[PDB]
Design a protein around this ligand. Structure first.
Ligand code: NAG
Ligand code: NAG
Ligand code: FER
Length: 275
């Protein structure tokens, strides 16, 4: 199949583009995976960057949605009250509307909506997890920043944000990061999607300190400690940390890898329950 653009998916407060990859052989009630590009990138660029995702859609019959940001140096808004908050607006609400359009038009399974992204797109994946746990079943964040780190920043890009987060200068307790997640949807009573995070120890763009902060954040959200660790998993130098009974949060730190950790489609699809 080929990637094509959706010109009208409904309300678009983030002024984003929507591109979609629908495999030739579709499931009857297909899952939907939102794949989010990084700063200075694009939907078409990310479609080309993560070359293993479209063939996995072909083999498993799920749909890929590639949102595109043309604002703030092509970065995802992870700073405004609107984008950070459930039903607030901006990019996160536009992405949710893309999901709703896809589920309706393609008779998708609303219980099988997932998101993955790299750097800026990984940041947004955690925003979607915290602000829209009623929409997403699982997320995979490659080389990102804990949810809410950029709250109140004057931008979300290398040229507009407060650089403390990217520099690894922001450290908060697990409880503080859990409080941040709760602020995405004050009064929310429910559960959160499965969260998988990845980071490289040599990342010069987004400090690997952010990996430790994400671990503090989601271990606190789910009330779990590390119970198991696998070395060289899934690749040499990757250390996989499994938390609790493994059903909610896992984390991978890749020795020697920089910006960004390449997407491991098997590990991410298995986390989503699709393979
Ligand atoms: C959570 O439960 C409380 C209990 O009264 C309710 O008032 C509130 O509306 C619930 N939150 C949501 C998001 O429905
Ligand atoms: C996690 O570890 C802390 C200290 O190591 C301990 O107090 C707490 O009970 C542990 N929680 C679980 C769920 O194992
Ligand atoms: C280097 O500083 C930053 C980088 C990013 C994102 C980079 C990417 O998506 O590749 C976002 C905010 C920053 O402050």
């Amino acid at each position: 199949a080929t990637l094509s653009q959706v010109l009208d998916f409904g309300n678009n407060p983030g002024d984003n583009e929507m591109w979609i990859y629908v495999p030739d052989q579709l499931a009857a009630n297909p899952a939907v995976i939102v794949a989010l590009h990084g700063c200075l990138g694009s939907a078409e660029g990310y479609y080309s960057e993560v070359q293993d995702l479209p063939p996995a859609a072909d083999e498993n019959g799920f749909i890929l949605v590639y949102p595109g940001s043309n604002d703030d140096f092509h970065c995802w808004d992870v700073a405004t009250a609107e984008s950070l908050t459930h039903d607030g607006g901006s990019d996160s609400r536009s992405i949710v509307n893309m999901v709703q359009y896809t589920l309706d038009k393609y008779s998708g399974d609303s219980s099988k909506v997932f998101t993955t992204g790299s750097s800026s797109g990984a940041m947004m994946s955690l925003v979607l997890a915290a602000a829209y746990p009623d929409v997403f079943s699982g997320v995979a964040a490659y080389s990102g920043v804990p949810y809410g780190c950029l709250r109140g920043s004057p931008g979300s890009s290398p040229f507009t944000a407060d650089q403390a987060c990217a520099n690894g200068e922001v450290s908060r307790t697990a409880q503080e990061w859990k409080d941040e997640v709760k602020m995405a949807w004050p009064g929310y009573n429910g559960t959160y999607p499965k969260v998988q995070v990845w980071h490289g120890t040599a990342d010069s763009v987004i400090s690997p300190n952010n990996f430790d902060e994400e671990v503090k954040q989601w271990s606190a959200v789910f009330g779990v400690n590390v119970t198991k660790e696998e070395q060289d998993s899934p690749l040499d130098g990757y250390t996989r940390s499994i938390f609790g009974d493994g059903s909610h949060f896992e984390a991978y730190l890749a020795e020697g890898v920089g910006h960004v950790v390449p997407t491991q489609v098997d590990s991410t699809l298995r986390w989503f329950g699709l393979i």
